[PDB]
């Protein structure tokens, strides 16, 4: 029902805040105010189906995107930070920057393959795929980044770890495929 239009507001109602973060009680009153709504209480009213679709696929890339843009983020200083001390061999440290982004390309891959009201399994089971590779990316951007920001100032003995954090991208992408593998096309 109406609950449709809210979650979008809910989702958006969040990202703004987390954005303005980069620029507590309110939780509890929700919980108690919720904790009562259950008990009152005498009869139960329970979850049920809606259409969904996209919200995963777009959330997938986006959630993934930041993972990159948050990866080059922590490194982007660190390279330049090394920088003026020894500006050359910036690019020898560049190999780090490339991974930090490629984990975004994972999930652009998603964006396509996910091209496509009974047996909702197509749509419904579509979603959690989007989120899973997305967050798997999201942190996959972290790991490569933090190593990189160390890699910059810190040779290849590093890069073992950076790639030891690369495969998270793949495995991150693999299951998103599998989890989508059985999914028929909706109208």
């Amino acid at each position: 029902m109406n609950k449709e239009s809210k979650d979008d507001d809910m989702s958006l109602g969040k990202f703004s805040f987390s954005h303005f973060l980069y620029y507590v009680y309110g939780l509890y009153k929700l919980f108690t105010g919720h904790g009562s709504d259950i008990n009152f209480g005498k009869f139960l009213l329970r979850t049920s189906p809606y259409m969904w679709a996209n919200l995963g696929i777009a959330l997938c890339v986006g959630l993934s995107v930041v993972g990159a843009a948050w990866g080059i983020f922590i490194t982007g200083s660190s390279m330049i930070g090394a920088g003026v001390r020894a500006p050359r061999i910036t690019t020898k440290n560049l190999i780090s920057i490339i991974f930090c982004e490629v984990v975004a390309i994972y999930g652009l891959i998603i964006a396509i393959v996910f091209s496509s009201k009974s047996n909702l399994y197509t749509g419904y089971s579509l979603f959690w795929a989007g989120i899973t590779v997305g967050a798997s990316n999201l942190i996959c951007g972290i790991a490569v980044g933090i190593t990189g920001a160390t890699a910059a100032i810190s040779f290849v003995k590093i890069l073992v770890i950076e790639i030891f954090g690369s495969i998270l991208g793949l495995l991150g992408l693999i299951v998103g495929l599998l989890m989508a593998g059985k999914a028929s096309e909706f109208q």
Binding site: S11, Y22, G62, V65, G76, L108
Partner: protein, 148 residues
């Protein structure tokens, strides 16, 4: 047919990033120019880079705008909602990246007028994030067809 909030959502977040990108870029920019007045026209790169992301969401919004309609298919905007968030959040990430590196670049290029090219490169390497989201929504837009 409420997903049109997406049509806003794109220009919304994308703006934020660009802003946020512009700021922490600009702060050092003016902060560096006092030491070296020359680097201004050079140090403008991040912001002019940064603002680009805005143009995306504009395109995104504009495209979605055409597609809204009093009636619609419930399917029509979801994708629309998906469209904006894609571009927008990506942008919001894009900016978050741009600005951070932005300060580093101008702060660095001050000290060593060499790494500037690198500072460009990383930035040149930053925006493609936005490009992806743009690509995403466009594809998503392309699928506004078949329309019930």
């Amino acid at each position: 047919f409420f997903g049109a909030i997406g049509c806003a959502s794109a220009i919304i977040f994308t703006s934020l990033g660009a802003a946020y990108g512009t700021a922490k870029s600009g702060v050092g920019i003016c902060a560096t120019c006092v030491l070296r007045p020359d680097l201004l026209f050079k140090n403008i790169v991040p912001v002019i880079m940064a603002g680009i992301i805005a143009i995306y969401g504009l395109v995104v919004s504009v495209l979605v705008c055409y597609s809204l309609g009093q009636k619609q298919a419930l399917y029509t905007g979801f994708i629309q909602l998906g469209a904006g968030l894609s571009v927008g959040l990506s942008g919001l990430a894009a900016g978050f990246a741009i600005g951070i590196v932005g300060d580093a670049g101008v702060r660095g290029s001050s000290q060593q007028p060499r790494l500037f090219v690198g500072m460009i490169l990383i930035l040149i390497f930053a925006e493609v994030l936005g490009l992806y989201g743009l690509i995403v929504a466009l594809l998503l837009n392309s699928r506004a067809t078949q329309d019930v």
